[PDB]
mmCIF file of C-alpha atoms and ligand atoms in Angstrom:
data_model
loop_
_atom_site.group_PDB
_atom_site.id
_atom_site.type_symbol
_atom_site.label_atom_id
_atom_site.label_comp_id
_atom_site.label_asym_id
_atom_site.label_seq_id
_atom_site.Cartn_x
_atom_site.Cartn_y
_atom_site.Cartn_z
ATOM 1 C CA UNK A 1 -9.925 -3.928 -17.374
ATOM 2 C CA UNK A 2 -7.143 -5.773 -19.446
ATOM 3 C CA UNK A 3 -3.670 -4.741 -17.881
ATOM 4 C CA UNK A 4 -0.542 -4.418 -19.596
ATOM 5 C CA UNK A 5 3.191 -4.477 -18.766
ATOM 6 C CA UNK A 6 4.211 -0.842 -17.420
ATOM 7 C CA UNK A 7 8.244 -0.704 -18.395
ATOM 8 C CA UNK A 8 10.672 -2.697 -20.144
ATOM 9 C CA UNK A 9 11.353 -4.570 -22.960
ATOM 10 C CA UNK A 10 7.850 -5.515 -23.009
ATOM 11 C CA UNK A 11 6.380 -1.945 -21.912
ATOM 12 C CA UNK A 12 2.853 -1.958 -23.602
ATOM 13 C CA UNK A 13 2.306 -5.089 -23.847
ATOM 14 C CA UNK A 14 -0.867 -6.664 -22.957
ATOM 15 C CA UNK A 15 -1.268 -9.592 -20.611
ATOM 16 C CA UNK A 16 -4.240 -12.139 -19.516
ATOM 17 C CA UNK A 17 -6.459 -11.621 -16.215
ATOM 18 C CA UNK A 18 -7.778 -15.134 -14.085
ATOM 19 C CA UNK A 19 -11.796 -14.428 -12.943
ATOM 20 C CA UNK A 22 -10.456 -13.480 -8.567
ATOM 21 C CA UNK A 23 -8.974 -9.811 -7.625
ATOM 22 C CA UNK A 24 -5.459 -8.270 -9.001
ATOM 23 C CA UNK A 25 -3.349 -5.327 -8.461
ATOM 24 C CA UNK A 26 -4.397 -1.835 -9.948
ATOM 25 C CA UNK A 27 -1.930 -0.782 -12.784
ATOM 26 C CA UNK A 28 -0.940 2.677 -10.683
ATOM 27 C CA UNK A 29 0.006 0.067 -7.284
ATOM 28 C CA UNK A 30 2.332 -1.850 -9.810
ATOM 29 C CA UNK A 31 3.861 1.213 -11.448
ATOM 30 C CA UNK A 32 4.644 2.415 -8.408
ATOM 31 C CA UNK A 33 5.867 -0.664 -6.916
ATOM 32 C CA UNK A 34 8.496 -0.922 -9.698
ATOM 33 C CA UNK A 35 9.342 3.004 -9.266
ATOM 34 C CA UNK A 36 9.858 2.298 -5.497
ATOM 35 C CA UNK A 37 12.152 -0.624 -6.248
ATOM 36 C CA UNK A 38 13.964 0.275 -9.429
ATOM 37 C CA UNK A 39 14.744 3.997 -7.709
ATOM 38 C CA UNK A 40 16.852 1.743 -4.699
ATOM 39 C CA UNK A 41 18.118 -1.330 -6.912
ATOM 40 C CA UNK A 42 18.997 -2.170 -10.506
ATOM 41 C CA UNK A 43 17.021 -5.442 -11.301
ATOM 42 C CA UNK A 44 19.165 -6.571 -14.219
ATOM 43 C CA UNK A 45 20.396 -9.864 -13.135
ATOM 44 C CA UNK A 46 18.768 -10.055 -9.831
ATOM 45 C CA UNK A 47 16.249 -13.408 -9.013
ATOM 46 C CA UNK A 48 12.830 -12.633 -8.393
ATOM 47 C CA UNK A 49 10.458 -14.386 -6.209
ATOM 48 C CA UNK A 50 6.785 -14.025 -7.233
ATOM 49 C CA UNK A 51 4.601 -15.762 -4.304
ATOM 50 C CA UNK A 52 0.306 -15.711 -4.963
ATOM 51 C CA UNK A 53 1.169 -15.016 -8.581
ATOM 52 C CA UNK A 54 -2.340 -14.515 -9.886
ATOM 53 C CA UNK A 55 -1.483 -13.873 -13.190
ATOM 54 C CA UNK A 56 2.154 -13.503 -12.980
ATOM 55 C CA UNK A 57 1.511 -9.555 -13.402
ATOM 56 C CA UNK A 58 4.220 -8.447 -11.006
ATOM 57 C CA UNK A 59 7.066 -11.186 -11.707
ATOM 58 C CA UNK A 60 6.084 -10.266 -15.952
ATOM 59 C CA UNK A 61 7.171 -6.998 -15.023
ATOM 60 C CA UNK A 62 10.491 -7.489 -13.236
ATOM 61 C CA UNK A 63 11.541 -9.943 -16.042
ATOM 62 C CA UNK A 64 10.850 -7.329 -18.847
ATOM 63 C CA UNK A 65 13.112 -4.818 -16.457
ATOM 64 C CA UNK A 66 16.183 -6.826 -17.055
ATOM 65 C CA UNK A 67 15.184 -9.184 -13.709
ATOM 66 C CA UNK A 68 17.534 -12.345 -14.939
ATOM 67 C CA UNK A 69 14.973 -14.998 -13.613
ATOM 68 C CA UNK A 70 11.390 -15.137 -11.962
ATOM 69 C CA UNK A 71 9.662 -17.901 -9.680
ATOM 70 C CA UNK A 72 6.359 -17.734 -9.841
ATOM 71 C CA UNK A 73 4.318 -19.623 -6.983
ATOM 72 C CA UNK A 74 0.506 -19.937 -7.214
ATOM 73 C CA UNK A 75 -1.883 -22.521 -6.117
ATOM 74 C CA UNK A 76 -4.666 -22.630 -8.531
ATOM 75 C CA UNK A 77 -4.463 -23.976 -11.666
ATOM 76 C CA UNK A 78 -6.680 -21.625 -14.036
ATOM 77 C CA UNK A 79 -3.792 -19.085 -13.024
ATOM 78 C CA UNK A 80 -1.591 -21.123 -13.410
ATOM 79 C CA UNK A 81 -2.425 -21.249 -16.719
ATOM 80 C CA UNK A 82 -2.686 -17.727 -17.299
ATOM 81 C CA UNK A 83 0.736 -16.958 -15.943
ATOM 82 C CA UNK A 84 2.028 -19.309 -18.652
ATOM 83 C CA UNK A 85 0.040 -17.904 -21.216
ATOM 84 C CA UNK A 86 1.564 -14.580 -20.380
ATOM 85 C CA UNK A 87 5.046 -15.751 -19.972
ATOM 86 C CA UNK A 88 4.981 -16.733 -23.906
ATOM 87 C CA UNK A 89 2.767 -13.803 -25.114
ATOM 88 C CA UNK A 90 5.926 -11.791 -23.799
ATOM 89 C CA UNK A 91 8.315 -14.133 -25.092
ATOM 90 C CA UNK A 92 11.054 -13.788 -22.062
ATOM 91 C CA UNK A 93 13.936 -16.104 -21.055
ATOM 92 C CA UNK A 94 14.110 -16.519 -17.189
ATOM 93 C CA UNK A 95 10.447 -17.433 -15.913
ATOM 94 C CA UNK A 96 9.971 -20.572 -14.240
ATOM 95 C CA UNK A 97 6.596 -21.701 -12.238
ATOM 96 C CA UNK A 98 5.673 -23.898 -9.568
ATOM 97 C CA UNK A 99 2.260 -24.288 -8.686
ATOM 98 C CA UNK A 100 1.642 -25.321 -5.317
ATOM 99 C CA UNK A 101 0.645 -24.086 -2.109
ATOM 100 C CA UNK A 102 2.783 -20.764 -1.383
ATOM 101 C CA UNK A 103 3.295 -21.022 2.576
ATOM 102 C CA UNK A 104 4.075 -24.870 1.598
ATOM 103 C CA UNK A 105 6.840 -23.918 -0.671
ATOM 104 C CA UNK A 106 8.210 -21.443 1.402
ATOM 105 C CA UNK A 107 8.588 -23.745 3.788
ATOM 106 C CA UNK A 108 10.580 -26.793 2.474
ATOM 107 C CA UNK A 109 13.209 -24.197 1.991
ATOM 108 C CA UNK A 110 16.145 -23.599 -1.603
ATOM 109 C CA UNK A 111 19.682 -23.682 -1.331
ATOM 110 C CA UNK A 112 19.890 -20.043 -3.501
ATOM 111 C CA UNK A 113 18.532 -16.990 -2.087
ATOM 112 C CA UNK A 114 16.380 -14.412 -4.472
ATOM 113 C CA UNK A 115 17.074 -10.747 -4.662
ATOM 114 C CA UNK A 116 13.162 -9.633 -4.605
ATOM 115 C CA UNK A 117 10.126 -11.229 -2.955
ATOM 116 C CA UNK A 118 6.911 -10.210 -4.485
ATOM 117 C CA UNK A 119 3.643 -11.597 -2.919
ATOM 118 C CA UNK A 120 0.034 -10.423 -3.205
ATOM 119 C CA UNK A 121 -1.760 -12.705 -0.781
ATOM 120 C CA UNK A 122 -5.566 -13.155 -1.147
ATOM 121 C CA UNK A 123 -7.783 -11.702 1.447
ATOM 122 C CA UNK A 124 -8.905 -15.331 2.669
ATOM 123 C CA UNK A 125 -5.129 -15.689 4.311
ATOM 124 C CA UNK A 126 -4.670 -13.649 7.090
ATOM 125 C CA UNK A 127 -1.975 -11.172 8.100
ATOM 126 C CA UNK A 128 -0.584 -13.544 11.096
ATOM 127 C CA UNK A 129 0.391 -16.075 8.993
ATOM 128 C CA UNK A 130 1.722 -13.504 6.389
ATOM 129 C CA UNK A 131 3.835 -13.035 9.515
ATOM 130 C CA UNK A 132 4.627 -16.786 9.212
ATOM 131 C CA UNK A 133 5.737 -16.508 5.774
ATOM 132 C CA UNK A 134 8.238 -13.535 6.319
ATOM 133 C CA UNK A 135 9.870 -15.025 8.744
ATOM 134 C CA UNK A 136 10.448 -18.103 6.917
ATOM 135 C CA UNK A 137 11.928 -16.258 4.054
ATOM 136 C CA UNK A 138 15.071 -15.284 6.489
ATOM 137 C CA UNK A 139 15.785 -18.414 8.084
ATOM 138 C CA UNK A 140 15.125 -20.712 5.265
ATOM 139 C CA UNK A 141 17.292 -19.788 2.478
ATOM 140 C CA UNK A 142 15.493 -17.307 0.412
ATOM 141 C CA UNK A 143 17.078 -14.201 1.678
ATOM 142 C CA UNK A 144 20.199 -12.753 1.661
ATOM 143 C CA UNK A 145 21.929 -9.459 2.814
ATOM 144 C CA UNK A 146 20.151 -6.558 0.611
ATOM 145 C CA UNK A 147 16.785 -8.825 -0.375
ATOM 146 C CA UNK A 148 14.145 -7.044 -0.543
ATOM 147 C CA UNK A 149 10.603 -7.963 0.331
ATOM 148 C CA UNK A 150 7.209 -6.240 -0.560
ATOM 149 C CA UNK A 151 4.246 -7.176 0.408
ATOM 150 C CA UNK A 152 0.552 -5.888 -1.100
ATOM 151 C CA UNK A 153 -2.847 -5.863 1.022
ATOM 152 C CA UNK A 154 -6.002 -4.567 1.167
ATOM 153 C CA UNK A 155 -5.862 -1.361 3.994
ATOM 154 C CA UNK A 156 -8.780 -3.480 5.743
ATOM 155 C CA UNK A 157 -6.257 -5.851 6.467
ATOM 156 C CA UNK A 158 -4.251 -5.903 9.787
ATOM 157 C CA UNK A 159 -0.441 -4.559 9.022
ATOM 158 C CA UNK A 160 2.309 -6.976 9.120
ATOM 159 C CA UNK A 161 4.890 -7.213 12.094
ATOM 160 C CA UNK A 162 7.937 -7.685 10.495
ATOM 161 C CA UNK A 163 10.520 -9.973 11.955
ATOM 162 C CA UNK A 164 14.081 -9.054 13.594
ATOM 163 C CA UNK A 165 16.806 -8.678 10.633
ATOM 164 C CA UNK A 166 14.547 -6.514 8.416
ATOM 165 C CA UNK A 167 14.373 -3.043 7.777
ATOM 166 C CA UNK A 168 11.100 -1.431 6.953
ATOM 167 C CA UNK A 169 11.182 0.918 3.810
ATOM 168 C CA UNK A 170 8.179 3.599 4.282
ATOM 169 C CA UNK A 171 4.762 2.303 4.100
ATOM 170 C CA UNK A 172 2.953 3.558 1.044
ATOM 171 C CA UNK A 173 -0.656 3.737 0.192
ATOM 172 C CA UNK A 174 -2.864 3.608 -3.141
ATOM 173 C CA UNK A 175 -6.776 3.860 -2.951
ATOM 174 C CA UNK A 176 -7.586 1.165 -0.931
ATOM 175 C CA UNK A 177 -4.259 -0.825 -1.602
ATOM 176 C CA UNK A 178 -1.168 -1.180 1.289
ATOM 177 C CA UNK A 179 2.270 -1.181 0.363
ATOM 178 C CA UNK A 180 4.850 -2.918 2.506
ATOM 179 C CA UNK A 181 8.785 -3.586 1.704
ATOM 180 C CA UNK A 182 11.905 -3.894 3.822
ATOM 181 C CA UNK A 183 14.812 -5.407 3.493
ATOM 182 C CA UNK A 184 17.220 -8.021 4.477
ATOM 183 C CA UNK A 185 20.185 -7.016 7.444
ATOM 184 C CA UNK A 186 22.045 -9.811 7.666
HETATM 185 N N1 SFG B 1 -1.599 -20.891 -0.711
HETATM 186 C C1 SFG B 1 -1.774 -20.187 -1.993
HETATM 187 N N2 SFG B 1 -0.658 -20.395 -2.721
HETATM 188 C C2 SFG B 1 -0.537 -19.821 -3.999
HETATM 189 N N3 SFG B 1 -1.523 -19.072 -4.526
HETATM 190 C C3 SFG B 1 -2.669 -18.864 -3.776
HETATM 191 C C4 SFG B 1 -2.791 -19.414 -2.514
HETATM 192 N N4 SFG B 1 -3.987 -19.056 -2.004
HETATM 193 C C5 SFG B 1 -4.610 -18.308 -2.941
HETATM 194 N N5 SFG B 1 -3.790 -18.183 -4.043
HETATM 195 C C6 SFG B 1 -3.914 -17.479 -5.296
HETATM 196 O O1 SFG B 1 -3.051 -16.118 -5.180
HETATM 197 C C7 SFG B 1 -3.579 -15.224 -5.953
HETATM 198 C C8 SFG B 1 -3.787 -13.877 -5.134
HETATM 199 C C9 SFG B 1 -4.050 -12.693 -6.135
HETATM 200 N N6 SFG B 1 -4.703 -11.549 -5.492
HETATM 201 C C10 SFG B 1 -2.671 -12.286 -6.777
HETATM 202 C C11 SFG B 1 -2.940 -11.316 -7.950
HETATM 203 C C12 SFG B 1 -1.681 -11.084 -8.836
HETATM 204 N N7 SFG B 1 -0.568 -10.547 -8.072
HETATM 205 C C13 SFG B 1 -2.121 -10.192 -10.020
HETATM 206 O O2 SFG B 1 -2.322 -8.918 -9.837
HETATM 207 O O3 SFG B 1 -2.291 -10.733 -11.159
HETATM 208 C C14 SFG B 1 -4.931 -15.845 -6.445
HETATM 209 O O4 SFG B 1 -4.709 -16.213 -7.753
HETATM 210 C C15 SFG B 1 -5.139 -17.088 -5.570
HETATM 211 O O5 SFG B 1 -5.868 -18.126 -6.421
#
């Protein structure tokens, strides 16, 4: 089942699968309808966290998204996200493999506009928690980010911390959809 960018510049275009278990091509067009109905992404920095194979951040960046970091642990995907990133031939992707709740962690000094993350069904929803709350306090966020979050409905929901507001929960097979947004 070989997915390909939705919309965009590089609408149509194919890109590369790892193994693994990645996002159904009616969760991501929808995920981009949901955001691009409530923002513009042209010039607004991405944040692509469990990257897989950079499916998500691709599509942002062929939007008009002015810069992507993807974040992804293993190295096979790795490697596939970089093999996509040339097959589309886009300016503005950069990727740091490493552990995501790691990253998040030690923090930036310039907040993104969009957090994207697809975590794997191994980490569970409490430390998801974990994660969200370090986006706020740790410098990825600003006033207006917003955050979505894809799981499996078998998972437990997230709780979302204080300074976020929850956009309606949305629901695709057996796929959850969660975004909110920075207060400030
Ligand atoms: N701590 C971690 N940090 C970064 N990536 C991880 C971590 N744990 C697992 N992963 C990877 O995150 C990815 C989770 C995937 N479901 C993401 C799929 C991706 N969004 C796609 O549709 O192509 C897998 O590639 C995992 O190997």
């Amino acid at each position: 089942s070989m997915t390909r960018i939705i919309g965009g510049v590089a609408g149509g275009r194919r890109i590369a699968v790892p193994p693994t278990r990645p996002t159904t091509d009616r969760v991501r067009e929808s995920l981009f309808n949901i955001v691009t109905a409530r923002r513009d992404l042209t010039g607004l920095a991405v944040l692509d966290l469990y990257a897989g194979s950079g499916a998500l951040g691709l599509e942002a960046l062929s939007r008009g998204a002015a810069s992507v970091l993807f974040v992804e642990s293993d190295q096979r995907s790795a490697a596939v996200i970089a093999r996509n990133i040339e097959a589309l031939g886009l300016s503005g992707a950069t990727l740091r493999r490493g552990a995501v709740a790691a990253v998040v962690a030690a923090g930036t000094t310039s907040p993104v506009d969009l957090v994207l993350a697809d975590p794997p069904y191994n980490v569970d929803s409490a430390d998801v928690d974990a994660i969200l709350a370090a986006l706020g306090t740790n410098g990825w966020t600003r006033e207006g980010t917003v955050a979505v979050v894809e799981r499996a409905t078998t998972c437990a929901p997230l709780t979302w911390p204080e300074g976020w507001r929850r956009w309606p929960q949305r629901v695709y097979g057996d796929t959850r959809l969660e975004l909110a947004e920075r207060l400030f």
